[PDB]
Amino acid sequence: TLEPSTSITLAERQQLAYDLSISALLGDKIYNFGELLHHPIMETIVNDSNYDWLFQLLNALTVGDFDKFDSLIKVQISKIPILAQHESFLRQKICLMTLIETVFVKNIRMLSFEDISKATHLPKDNVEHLVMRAISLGLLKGSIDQVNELVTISWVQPRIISGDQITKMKDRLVEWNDQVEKLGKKMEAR
Amino acid sequence: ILDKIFYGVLDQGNGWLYVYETPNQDATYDSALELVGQLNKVVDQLFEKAS
Amino acid sequence: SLVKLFTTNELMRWPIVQKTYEPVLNEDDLAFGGEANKHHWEDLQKRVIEHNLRVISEYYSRITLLRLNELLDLTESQTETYISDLVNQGIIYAKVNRPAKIVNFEKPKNSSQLLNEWSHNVDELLEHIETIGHLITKEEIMHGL
Amino acid sequence: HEKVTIAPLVLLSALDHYERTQTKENKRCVGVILGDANSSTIRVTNSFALPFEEDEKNSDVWFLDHNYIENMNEMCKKINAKEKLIGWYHSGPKLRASDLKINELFKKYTQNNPLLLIVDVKQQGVGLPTDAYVAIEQEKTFLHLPCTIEAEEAEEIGVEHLLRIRLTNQLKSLKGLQSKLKDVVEYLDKVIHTILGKLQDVFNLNNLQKALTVKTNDELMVIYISNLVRSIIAFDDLIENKIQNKKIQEQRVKD
Amino acid sequence: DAFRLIDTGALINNLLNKANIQALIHGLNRHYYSLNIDYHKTAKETKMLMNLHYEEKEESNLAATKSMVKIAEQYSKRIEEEKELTEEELKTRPKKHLSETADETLENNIVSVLTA
């Protein structure tokens, strides 16, 4: 609301941005770091001095290193009891989105324990408990079949912010159009 | 089991009860069989009259 | 937060929670006034156990028997008794492998059940086409400019 | 469900509007649509042309008669009591930015969110060619509502009196895909948003359907076996008809 | 219907003859008569009337989908109707009615196989 009109004073951008950065780390409430790219909290104002933390958050989520999570936080944000649990939630959501896109090319949604264990960098048992907490919330709407050791996943992913996704989509749109076209031909014939 | 209240079986070879129940579908052998019977009779009657 | 504990539940939660919190959770002060502190514990115990199984049927699709008892923190006999009571109540339906240590969360099928699912995907698809039509109409006008 | 029902009288009056106002060169012609739409089901029952004059290098210059809407509405009231203000009509063929400013004018004088009915008049669309939109908040933006025919038992007989599946369904679908494709190629030119999100989603939800069609076939096969029986029952009545005929024929020869 | 009274000035050849009508307008001016009807129309009006009967696509298809969901039941009731029909014809040994009932059942099956 703020950036088009109403309160475009730098003061107001700067306080609101600082609050945005602290809250994203504490929460896990809405998606990951795509929301931060699209709207400005480091390029209507400073790229440094507690917006350094943002660029590091992006590196940490993809990689999944605990050490990079430890180093980015400074005393004000860190002291708070809230953040650390919610760090693991953000890591699963992002990693999950990356594996799923990869496999998805027609309708594939099967990803193993082994793919998710690897991503998080946690053994299977920690992951078992962790996914079980995450499905509760409804950040996952697949289901975990314990003794198959496969996760059969029913889409939950947002799939948004495109650059890679558009190239792939274009490829798919064309293929579908061909498939339909043959059906259409047969009808036309009789 | 012979009365067929619950579909299990007894496994005499090892001493277990095993899940026989995953169900059948009704009303499709039965549906046909009825239709058939009436029709054959209706044809037969009509033929006598014709001739 | 206690009604929220039943939804996320892994059942290692509860005595830590029970013990930490009883301002009103073996107590009352404007209704019963208390019933009996030990007697309220009984009602609490059966509900948490019951609710941990209700959420597990939805979330899982296979679980081992060894793993289910571990969550409940009870003996295999006791998990078995709670499972029996719940399938009877008919809030959840499950199948039991006693010697091979699997609890399936499966219940009957017919092809027609999955027919409805096929025809739901068709239905999401037709509705998509109506949205698609209107969207194209909006998109074009912007293209021109 | 939210629904619009449109009289033929409305659309033929629109057909007449466009010639009767001599509006040419793909300019705008404007009138008022009338009915009852106090509810969320729009019933469009009547209409009138409104004097409209547009400039030939500005469509944000418009001349539209406010007094006429108000004054003609009073005459409408004295004639029938079903014929209230609900919206307006334009000759299309698309939405405009200038559509909003006129829509804003009608908003005061309506008792529901003002309906913009786009009547295409060129008759080079498929099916019912008219698309119905209602202004709501997004700025302000138009949103498609389902637009269908109307019936009155006399009126539908009169529509016919003047004039006297699978292949189509499928052809119209491919037609859609083709249009979706065109829009995407155009967007790709523009680039080098809502649309994209929609395309990805669709894709996710032929491929996914494949596995389930296999189950459908076993149930369909039972249905074909049923067909087989049905033909035989019908066949029985046909046979009977031939015998009755036969008896008559034989008797005819004899006399 | 379309009417006009006697009004003359061109209707003077109107209401082995001809004594009658001269005396008819001379004895009385203003008496009804009917007039002929024709309808002339315009091709854009004409095309609009026929495109009454993509919303179109959505609707036909919608019913097709929901028909397929419910067919498990639609199957059962039509065997029962059919079972009845066969029985009636036995007693019967009217004909039109028995045929029509069978014809409806057959029509419906074809449409149902077609749907998937």
Curated annotation (Swiss-Prot), chain A:
Signal sequence range: none
Disulphide-bridged cysteine pairs: none
Entry coiled-coil feature ranges: none
Location of the PCI domain: 1-158
Note: Present with 12400 molecules/cell in log phase SD medium.
UniProt similarity note: Belongs to the proteasome subunit S11 family.
Function: Acts as a regulatory subunit of the 26S proteasome which is involved in the ATP-dependent degradation of ubiquitinated proteins.
Stated name of the protein: 26S proteasome regulatory subunit RPN9
Organism in which the protein naturally occurs: Saccharomyces cerevisiae (strain ATCC 204508 / S288c) (Baker's yeast)
Gene designation per UniProt: RPN9
UniProtKB/Swiss-Prot annotation, chain B:
Mod. after translation: N-acetylated by NAT1.
Function in brief: Component of the lid subcomplex of the 26S proteasome, a multiprotein complex involved in the ATP-dependent degradation of ubiquitinated proteins. In the complex, RPN6 is required for proteasome assembly.
Similarity comment: Belongs to the proteasome subunit S9 family.
Misc note: Present with 16800 molecules/cell in log phase SD medium.
Quaternary structure and interacting proteins, as annotated: Component of the lid subcomplex of the 19S proteasome regulatory particle complex (also named PA700 complex). The 26S proteasome consists of a 20S proteasome core and two 19S regulatory subunits.
Record-given protein name: 26S proteasome regulatory subunit RPN6
Gene that encodes the chain: RPN6
First and last residues shown, out of full length: 381 to 431 of 434
Swiss-Prot record, chain D:
Modifications made to the protein after synthesis: N-acetylated by NAT1.
SMART domains: JAB_MPN
GO molecular function, one term: metallopeptidase activity
GO CC entries: proteasome complex; proteasome regulatory particle, lid subcomplex; proteasome storage granule
Keyword terms of this UniProt record: Acetylation, Phosphoprotein, Proteasome
GO biological process, one term: ubiquitin-dependent protein catabolic process
Pfam families assigned: JAB, MitMem_reg
Chain ranges of the MPN domain: 4-138
Organism domain of life: Eukaryota
CDD domains with a match to the protein in the record: MPN_RPN7_8
Function of the molecule: Acts as a regulatory subunit of the 26S proteasome which is involved in the ATP-dependent degradation of ubiquitinated proteins.
Similarity section: Belongs to the peptidase M67A family.
Note: Present with 19800 molecules/cell in log phase SD medium.
Name of the protein: 26S proteasome regulatory subunit RPN8
Organism name: Saccharomyces cerevisiae (strain ATCC 204508 / S288c) (Baker's yeast)
From Swiss-Prot, chain E:
Post-translational modification: N-acetylated by NAT3.
Membrane-spanning segments: none
Miscellaneous field: Present with 16400 molecules/cell in log phase SD medium.
SUBUNIT field: Component of the lid subcomplex of the 19S proteasome regulatory particle complex (also named PA700 complex). The 26S proteasome consists of a 20S proteasome core and two 19S regulatory subunits. Interacts directly with RPN8 and STS1.
Domain notes: The JAMM motif is required for the deubiquitination and degradation of ubiquitinated substrates.
Protein family (similarity comment): Belongs to the peptidase M67A family.
Function description: Component of the lid subcomplex of the 26S proteasome, a multiprotein complex involved in the ATP-dependent degradation of ubiquitinated proteins. RPN11 is the only catalytically active member of the lid and serves as the essential deubiquitinase of the proteasome.
Protein name: Ubiquitin carboxyl-terminal hydrolase RPN11
